[PDB]
């Protein structure tokens, strides 16, 4: 099945790279990139939240949850950064 980077929660400033397995009907990886921080907790530096997704599309609607910039594959873990 697809496998992508996905971390627990959106908690840990940084390493958020775990193999986590996505949903059968899903074929695509996503990633929020955002450096911004509003309030603790929080690091030097950025923060990241990498989820399963079943269309890969760059596009910021609302960007109302810190969705930036996304980073989206179609290949079990496309990108081992964080």
Excluded: W
């Excluded at 921080?37 to 030097?44: G, I, V």
């Excluded at 596009?59 to 930036?68: M, V």
């Amino acid at each position: 099945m697809l496998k992508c980077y996905t971390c627990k929660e959106p908690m840990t400033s940084a390493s958020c790279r775990t193999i986590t397995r996505c949903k059968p009907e899903d074929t695509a990886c996503m990633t929020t990139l955002v450096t911004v921080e509003a309030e603790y907790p929080f690091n030097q530096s950025p923060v990241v939240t990498r989820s399963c997704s079943s269309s890969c599309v760059a596009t910021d609607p609302d960007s109302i949850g810190a969705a930036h910039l996304i980073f989206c594959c179609f290949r079990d873990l496309c990108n081992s950064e964080l």
